[PDB]
Every structure is written in C-alpha cells, then in structure tokens.
Design a protein around this ligand. Structure first.
Ligand SMILES: Nc1ncnc2c1ncn2[C@@H]1O[C@H](CSCC[C@H](N)C(=O)O)[C@@H](O)[C@H]1O
Ligand SMILES: Nc1ncnc2c1ncn2[C@@H]1O[C@H](CSCC[C@H](N)C(=O)O)[C@@H](O)[C@H]1O
Ligand SMILES: [Cl-]
Ligand SMILES: [Cl-]
Lengths: 230, 230
C-alpha cells in the first residue's frame, strides 16, 4: 500500500503512536530528527516528532517527503480550543490552516498573507471525510474547522479574540499550518488531527500539563483508527 | 569543487545573482520553488529564491540540501537596521541568528527558545572570516553581528527596542534564522549576508521600496566576490 508519514510535534505525541501500531521500528536519524520506520498492514509507516513550532515541523515534513518518499502525511497532537463546543479531549480535523503570526501589514497585505502564497492552506477532503465517518461510527464528536498555527503558545483572552475575529479559527497550535503547507507544495495529501488539552487562555499552561498524556493518546488512537481504514 | 547553494527570499534578490555569475542555468522546479543549476569556476551552483518568511525558507533550504546535495549555503538579501552604524546599503554577516517571534514564555522559557533547540543559531566562522577579509580588501565596511528573524515585517520603534534589548540584534529580516537553522541540523556550512534597505521603523515600507534594487545588488555583488574566493 501507500507509504504513510505520521507526525507529532513532541515526543509525548508519538510515544502512544509507536505503542498502538506495535510493530518493529527501525530508528533512522536525519536532520536532527529520529524517524521510526516500520511495516503495518502492508503499508510502510514512518513516524517522527518534529520538535515544536513552524521551522522544526517544516523541516521534518520536507524530510519525510524528500528522504523517505511518503505518499501521505497524518499529523496527530494536542491543541488549544478557541470555541466553546471544543471541550478538553475533543478532536478536530483542520479543513484549512493559517499562519496566524504572519504580518506584512506594512505593505497593506492581509494578516496571514505572504506574496506568492495564500492565507489559507488546504488539507485532504478525502482524509477529513474519512475521519468524520470514523468518528460518526465510533459515536464520538469530531469538529471540522480552521486551525491557526504560530510560533507562540497562546494563553490570553486577547489573542484568542484575535484568532477568532481575524481567521474564524476553532483551535490554535504551533505546527499544523507548516506541515500542511509543505504537503501542499509537494502535492502530498495531508490530514491534521488535534485533541484539545487547554483553552488557550490564562490557565492554559497548567491545563496543557494536566492533559498532555490523555489528549495525546486520544489523538493517537484516532489516527491509528484512520490508518486501519487506509 | 564543492557544490554551493545560493539563496535569496525574493526574486529581486536573486535576479542580480544570476546575472553576475553569467553562466547558463537550467531551471528545475521542486516544492513550489524554481532552482537554477549552473557551473561556475568548476563549482556547481544552485540558485533559488525561497519566497518570504520562515516556512518558505526552511522548505527551500531543506530541498537544496536533500534534493540537490549542496555542500554549503550562502544567503543574500536585504534587511532592516537596528543599530546606528548600519546605514542604508551597508553589509553585515550574521554571527548568530535568533527567531525573535518565538514565545513559549507561558512555560517560563526565555523568548526565542524552543525545547530541544537553542536561542541562537551559529553560522560558519570560516565563511564569515572570509567575508570580513574580502570587505577589508575591497575597502568597504562589514558588520558582524546578531540577526533577528521572524514572520513580521518590523516597522516600529517599539519592536526595534525589543529586538535590541532582548537579543542585542543588529538587523532584522524574515529568513536568516530558518536558513541557518536547517543548515546546522544537516551539518552544512552557512553564511547569511544582508544589505540594509531600511531602518525597521515607521518609514521602513517606503525605504524598503526605494532601496530594494540597489541593496539587493550590493548584497549579490558581495556574495559573488565570496564565491570567487571559494
Ligand atoms: N494554547 C496553545 N497554543 C499554542 N500551541 C498549543 C496550544 N496548546 C497546544 N499547543 C501545541 O502543544 C505545543 C505547545 S508548546 C509546549 C511546550 C512544553 N510545555 C514545554 O515546556 O516543553 C505545541 O507543539 C503546540 O502545537
Ligand atoms: N524591516 C524589516 N523587517 C522584516 N524583514 C525585513 C525588513 N527589511 C527587509 N526585510 C526582508 O525583506 C522582506 C520583507 S517582506 C517584503 C514584502 C514586499 N514588499 C511585498 O509586499 O511583496 C523579507 O524577505 C525580509 O527578510
Ligand atoms: Cl497569548
Ligand atoms: Cl513592528
């Protein structure tokens, strides 16, 4: 079958992935990352955590595509909620992503926009539709919405209000847009899956720590259930 | 000789490079970029502009290394000055670079710091020393200092004051840190060269436009003079 890249940002997001697949993994170092290469149900799977933020995740995604030849990329990890209906532990897939910290307003560009690019980055409608069917069959909620990504941990009402007002974002994190961007440039299907671990408000640091393990597992379990249908 | 990658962020930064080398270039598309491949003085040179900002430049640098096998990367382009002694048209090389917009302060991390990384990214002391010797021999100034990179065009006294206070930066731009970061991860020597086109203040947009062509040429000429010694 088609070779699948599986990414998280932090080690804690991929430890449950490696465990859930349960196969032998070969560890391959490249570019400051460790890639775990295995075979699962007649598919080659390549798993890594990128390290946090846009530069790290851009690098790792580019390596997955150029050095390992992955044919699709699935991202799993944790995020901050920007909307009341996304509770702690809830899942969402990103229909579109934006780099919320991009600002070329000095030249009258819309926030998020860079010349020769676009504000919103698209993901795979097929993979998102698959996620929604699996969630419906598992009888669990799954939101489909905009994820905002930037190189700051968001933990204030004011920044939340900006993200909602400017981009109508549903969640915030630090890698999705860059992963999805790289995949679009190389024509590789991508799905960005997140489980909420905090509300991106003044208490978000403490919530992040409280729920990292559970929310990371929630996302990882759901990602595995997608791979089982691929 | 050793294969050299040459990067700018914008087309206007590489047009003078292609012209100055004056050789036949083959255009090769990959990942949303166009790479110009030529031979100059027994060296293969690969020239591209990345498009603006951290994600674009991370992607392109990673492609240069993984897909084209470059053995060193030289970046040329324009920047905003943060220090009085860096005038319009003046050159600097980055001794160290920082991602000035990275903020994980919610977890008590220093600004600029990401777990499993470092605030400052190093460049090649050999290439920087070469630049300084060439500048001394050409009888022109060359500053050696910290460059701050982020995904915003900086055009305010307040943000300038932050960059100077927090990082002791000499100039600001949107790609150097990410280029240098990728090169460090892959063990590839890097030099980031910039010519000042504005003062990163409230008038910076208009200055940027006034001096883009000249400052881009100033940097490009100097980069060519480095390649001539390699
Ligand atoms: N409120 C929020 N804002 C930004 N990113 C968030 C977030 N909630 C979760 N994330 C995601 O989780 C990570 C936040 S940074 C976590 C740092 C960690 N506590 C440490 O100190 O080492 C990023 O990978 C990001 O994508
Ligand atoms: N004051 C400054 N702040 C941030 N980047 C700057 C800068 N001065 C020059 N740069 C560099 O020049 C570019 C600024 S963005 C330029 C956008 C352009 N005027 C347009 O509208 O299409 C980036 O590649 C950046 O690295
Ligand atoms: Cl915030
Ligand atoms: Cl500013």
């Amino acid at each position: 079958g088609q070779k699948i890249g599986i990414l998280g940002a932090m080690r804690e997001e991929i430890t449950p992935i490696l465990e859930l697949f349960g196969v032998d993994f070969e560890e391959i170092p490249l570019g400051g990352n460790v890639f775990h290469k295995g075979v699962y149900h007649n598919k080659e799977i390549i798993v890594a955590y990128s390290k946090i933020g846009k530069v790290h995740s851009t690098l790792t995604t580019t390596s997955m595509i150029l050095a390992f030849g992955v044919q699709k990329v699935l991202f799993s990890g944790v995020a901050g909620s920007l909307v009341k209906d996304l509770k702690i532990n809830d899942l969402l897939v990103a229909t579109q992503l934006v780099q919320h910290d991009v600002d070329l307003s000095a030249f009258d560009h819309p926030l998020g926009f860079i010349p020769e690019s676009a504000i919103f980055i698209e993901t795979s409608g097929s993979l998102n539709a698959l996620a929604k069917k699996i969630a419906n069959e598992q009888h669990i909620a799954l939101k489909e919405g905009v994820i905002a990504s930037g190189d700051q941990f968001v933990h204030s009402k004011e920044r939340k209000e900006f993200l909602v007002s400017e981009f109508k974002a549903s969640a915030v994190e630090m890698e999705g847009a860059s992963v999805a961007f790289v995949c679009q440039k190389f024509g590789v299907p991508c799905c960005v899956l997140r489980s909420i671990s905090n509300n991106a408000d003044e208490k978000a640091g403490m919530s992040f720590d409280e729920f990292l393990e559970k929310s990371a597992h929630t996302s990882a379990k759901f990602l595995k259930s997608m791979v089982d249908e691929l």
